[PDB]
Amino acid sequence: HVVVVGGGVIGLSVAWQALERGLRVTVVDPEPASKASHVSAGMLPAANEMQEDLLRLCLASRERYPSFVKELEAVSGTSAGYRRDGVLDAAFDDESLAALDGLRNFLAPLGVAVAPLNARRCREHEPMLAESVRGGLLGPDDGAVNPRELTAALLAAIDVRGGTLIRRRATEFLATPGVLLENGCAVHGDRVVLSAGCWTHRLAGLPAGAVPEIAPAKGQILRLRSAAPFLRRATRAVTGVYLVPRTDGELVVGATYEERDYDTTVTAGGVAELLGKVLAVLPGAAELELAETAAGLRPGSPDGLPVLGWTAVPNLLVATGHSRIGVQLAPITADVMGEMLVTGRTPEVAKAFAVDRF
Amino acid sequence: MHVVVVGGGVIGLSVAWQALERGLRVTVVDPEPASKASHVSAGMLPAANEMLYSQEDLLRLCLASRERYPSFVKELEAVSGTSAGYRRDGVLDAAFDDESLAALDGLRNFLAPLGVAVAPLNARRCREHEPMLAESVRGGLLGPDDGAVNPRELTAALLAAIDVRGGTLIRRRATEFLADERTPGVLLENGCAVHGDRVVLSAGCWTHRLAGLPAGAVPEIAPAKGQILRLRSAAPFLRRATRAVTRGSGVYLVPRTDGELVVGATYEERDYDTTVTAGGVAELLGKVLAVLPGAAELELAETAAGLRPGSPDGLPVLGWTAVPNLLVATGHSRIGVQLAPITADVMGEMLVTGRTPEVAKAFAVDRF
Ligand SMILES: Cc1cc2nc3c(=O)[nH]c(=O)nc-3n(C[C@H](O)[C@H](O)[C@H](O)COP(=O)(O)OP(=O)(O)OC[C@H]3O[C@@H](n4cnc5c(N)ncnc54)[C@H](O)[C@@H]3O)c2cc1C
Numbered sequence: 239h240v241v242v243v244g245g246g247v248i249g250l251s252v253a254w255q256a257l258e259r260g261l262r263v264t265v266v267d268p269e270p271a272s273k274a275s276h277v278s279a280g281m282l283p284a285a286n287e288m289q290e291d292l293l294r295l296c297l298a299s300r301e302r303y304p305s306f307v308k309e310l311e312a313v314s315g316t317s318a319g320y321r322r323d324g325v326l327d328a329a330f331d332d333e334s335l336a337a338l339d340g341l342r343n344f345l346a347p348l349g350v351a352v353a354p355l356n357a358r359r360c361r362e363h364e365p366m367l368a369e370s371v372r373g374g375l376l377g378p379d380d381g382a383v384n385p386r387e388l389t390a391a392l393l394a395a396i397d398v399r400g401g402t403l404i405r406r407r408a409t410e411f412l413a414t415p416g417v418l419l420e421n422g423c424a425v426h427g428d429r430v431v432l433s434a435g436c437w438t439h440r441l442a443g444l445p446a447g448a449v450p451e452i453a454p455a456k457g458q459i460l461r462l463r464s465a466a467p468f469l470r471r472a473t474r475a476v477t478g479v480y481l482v483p484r485t486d487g488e489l490v491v492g493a494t495y496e497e498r499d500y501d502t503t504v505t506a507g508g509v510a511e512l513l514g515k516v517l518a519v520l521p522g523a524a525e526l527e528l529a530e531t532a533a534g535l536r537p538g539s540p541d542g543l544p545v546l547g548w549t550a551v552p553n554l555l556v557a558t559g560h561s562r563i564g565v566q567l568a569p570i571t572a573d574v575m576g577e578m579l580v581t582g583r584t585p586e587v588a589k590a591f592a593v594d595r596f
Numbered sequence: 597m598h599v600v601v602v603g604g605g606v607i608g609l610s611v612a613w614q615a616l617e618r619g620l621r622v623t624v625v626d627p628e629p630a631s632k633a634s635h636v637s638a639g640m641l642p643a644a645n646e647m648l649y650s651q652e653d654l655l656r657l658c659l660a661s662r663e664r665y666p667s668f669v670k671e672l673e674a675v676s677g678t679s680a681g682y683r684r685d686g687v688l689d690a691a692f693d694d695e696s697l698a699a700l701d702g703l704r705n706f707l708a709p710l711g712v713a714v715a716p717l718n719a720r721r722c723r724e725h726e727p728m729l730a731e732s733v734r735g736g737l738l739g740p741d742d743g744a745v746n747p748r749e750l751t752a753a754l755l756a757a758i759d760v761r762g763g764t765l766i767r768r769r770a771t772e773f774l775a776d777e778r779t780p781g782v783l784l785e786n787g788c789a790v791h792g793d794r795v796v797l798s799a800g801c802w803t804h805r806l807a808g809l810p811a812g813a814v815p816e817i818a819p820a821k822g823q824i825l826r827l828r829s830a831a832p833f834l835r836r837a838t839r840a841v842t843r844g845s846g847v848y849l850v851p852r853t854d855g856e857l858v859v860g861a862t863y864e865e866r867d868y869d870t871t872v873t874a875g876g877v878a879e880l881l882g883k884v885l886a887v888l889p890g891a892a893e894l895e896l897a898e899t900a901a902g903l904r905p906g907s908p909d910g911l912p913v914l915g916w917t918a919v920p921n922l923l924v925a926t927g928h929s930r931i932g933v934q935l936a937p938i939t940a941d942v943m944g945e946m947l948v949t950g951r952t953p954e955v956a957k958a959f960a961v962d963r964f
């Protein structure tokens with residue numbers, strides 16, 4: 239029996255896979271998949287700026303995505319919203335075209351399908367790009383997922399396998415381990431896993447130093463809409479901004495990266511920045527409906543790398559600090575914590591993210 | 597006597613109220629009163645704007661409405677016991693380059709003849725009146741007797757007042773005009789009918805569209821779309837209604853007492869569409885951030901989009917139609933909130949006396 243605290247994409251995912259491996263699971267979260275995971279664009283390109291250990295974690299998660307989704311859609315009988323029709327990286331000036339050559343050279347060694355495109359061919363793949371486009375890479379095996387549909391499926395699956403969901407705040411950690419809930423009741427389990435995003439470290443009762451600081455990094459994000467999709471595929475455009483089309487006309491446009499503590503106010507400043515970026519690279523998007531503006535807090539860590547594994551406190555694990563890439567990493571995270579729970583050992587691929595490194 | 601008012605936006609609630617004030621019996625027909633252009637409107641009340649340099653008739657209409665605003669609000673707040681949201685702490689015009697500073701000298705010269713309080717301000721003094729302006733500000737005029745109203749609060753009061761005086765509100769669409777009987781009337785979506793001794797049409801850009809209207813009776817009141825946004829802070833960010841012009845176009849910025857900050861507006865040709873667009877919102881945000889750099893931090897609380905009621909020559913349409921006992925009051929485009937009160941008087945008088953006040957003659961329907 240494992241108690242998972244926080245039920246965003248990371249903790250739902252851990253909970254599901256733990257169930258898949260015969261364990262008994264309880265998820266504690268007053269509003270599951272309501273925070274960063276609700277707001278997230280869920281883009282899944284092969285890589286990004288953010289280093290070699292983390293790369294190996296990502297590529298593995300990438301390897302696993304298709305099988306993870308399929309296993310899930312089967313259990314839940316729900317769609318998860320994973321699309322694999324490719325990610326397009328587009329560059330708009332010398333400096334960003336330079337970075338793309340660097341990127342190609344980074345990706346080929348690792349058997350990631352990449353296809354360089356000249357300006358002409360960038361425009362043929364996406365007619366809606368601005369003529370100022372200079373070059374681009376297509377990564378046809380990459381794509382995007384809708385985290386809203388993914389977290390819904392995870393819930394359905396967790397339920398189907400008979401995991402419990404307690405929609406209450408965990409107010410305190412208890413020494414077997416357990417948590418106290420806002421309504422006075424307690425939940426203990428043979429293992430506790432903390433996966434509460436930027437609130438993880440804040441839970442009262444945690445022994446000093448047990449969990450590192452998971453600092454919020456605010457991100458505003460918007461969603462445009464049209465009757466039929468406007469953009470052909472997940473598209474990332476740099477001088478940057480990313481643009482994730484959904485099957486139903488939704489078009490996600492992210493993202494600001496800001497340091498504002500726990501604030502999730504949508505600001506004239508934020509929205510203008512995003513709108514400027516997207517209109518710059520997709521001039522026809524002017525008439526697209528502005529359907530939603532929103533703002534989430536990315537879970538950070540002191541060195542900006544994920545925090546997975548055992549704490550100094552016995553039977554108390556964590557799975558958090560995924561910052562900009564939790565949707566991408568969710569599946570590997572769920573395996574690695576699975577194994578950890580069952581075997582008690584730490585898979586090689588996760589060793590670099592132990593908590594004890596601080 | 598009994599007048600049926602069709603449409604209950606600011607113009608028609610206003611007409612209905614004043615008509616009641618003058619002893620008449622009134623029925624307002626509107627499925628969603630004050631939900632359209634009047635719901636979205638910023639409600640700015642500066643002394644003038646661009647449409648008035650050339651139209652001396654419309655200027656006179658506006659100035660009269662201006663004269664009347666304070667008395668109209670007071671009479672209303674009394675009857676309704678509600679606040680209407682009228683603030684008179686001034687409108688500030690600010691210029692940000694040569695070309696817009698030139699226009700302001702022109703504006704000063706336009707306004708003095710007409711006994712409108714204006715006070716020119718150098719860059720220094722612009723920044724003292726509004727600390728939040730960008731350093732690039734060049735010059736500005738203050739019009740301390742001007743200001744703004746919150747149309748949402750105004751239209752609520754009008755409703756309360758209309759009720760208090762016992763006017764009827766029928767929350768249904770008028771589907772058809774009923775013509776050629778001893779008295780005029782409208783048919784409603786639910787099959788029922790309402791006749792009255794007079795019908796007044798005041799349905800914005802829908803006015804002309806009502807079925808059963810004799811051809812040519814009402815001119816085309818073409819929709820002119822406008823997107824508009826509202827930012828917010830706990831305490832007001834801007835001291836007063838502010839209109840800022842730079843690099844050829846402008847933006848207006850209307851603070852409310854409670855932190856709301858209205859930012860308008862796009863002028864677009866999209867028929868009846870009221871979609872909020874990346875394009876629209878970006879335009880507005882750009883303009884405001886340019887002239888109020890600190891507004892970056894402000895919450896974006898609302899984005900919205902209304903349809904201004906136009907007319908073939910862009911002037912209001914008030915008075916009798918060729919159809920007997922059928923009047924109109926519409927076509928106020930960008931300035932209906934400002935004109936609402938004079939509109940209400942002029943239509944009042946018209947209803948009671950049967951004659952057309954001089955100030956309104958230039959806006960007769962028959963001019964087409
Ligand atoms: C704008 C934006 C765009 C993004 N785009 C992408 C992208 O394109 N691709 C990608 O891979 N990643 C993206 N991410 C990252 C991804 O969403 C995060 O890494 C992800 O949320 C991590 O999941 P989480 O469950 O740790 O955090 P969350 O989703 O924040 O979940 C934390 C959960 O903990 C719960 N909680 C808090 N306190 C308590 C308590 N006391 N008791 C119980 N529960 C509690 C909350 O209710 C919440 O549901 C993006 C993030 C943002 C903000």
Ligand SMILES: Cc1cc2nc3c(=O)[nH]c(=O)nc-3n(C[C@H](O)[C@H](O)[C@H](O)COP(=O)(O)OP(=O)(O)OC[C@H]3O[C@@H](n4cnc5c(N)ncnc54)[C@H](O)[C@@H]3O)c2cc1C
Nearest residue numbers: 603605607632633634637638640770800902931932933934
């Ligand atoms: C973005 C924006 C900003 C503005 N800013 C300002 C400003 O600063 N100052 C200013 O003076 N003005 C401003 N205006 C202008 C002012 O809003 C309009 O001129 C005014 O709202 C017009 O009033 P109306 O009552 O004629 O229009 P509306 O309020 O649109 O009247 C139409 C009404 O008729 C009703 N209706 C429609 N069909 C029927 C039917 N068949 N039967 C019954 N009822 C019906 C509708 O339900 C609606 O309530 C602005 C307008 C916009 C769009």
Ligand SMILES: CCCCCC[C@H](CC(=O)O)SCC(=O)O
Nearest residue numbers: 281283284285286493562563566
């Ligand atoms: C390993 C790929 C994970 C993709 C997330 C990429 C996104 C775009 C980028 O950094 O290029 S960051 C999403 C965000 O947190 O705004």
Ligand SMILES: CCCCCC[C@H](CC(=O)O)SCC(=O)O
Nearest residue numbers: 640642643644645861930931934
């Ligand atoms: C004297 C009429 C004042 C109302 C209109 C003022 C606003 C600013 C301007 O035109 O300069 S226009 C409101 C609109 O966007 O329709």
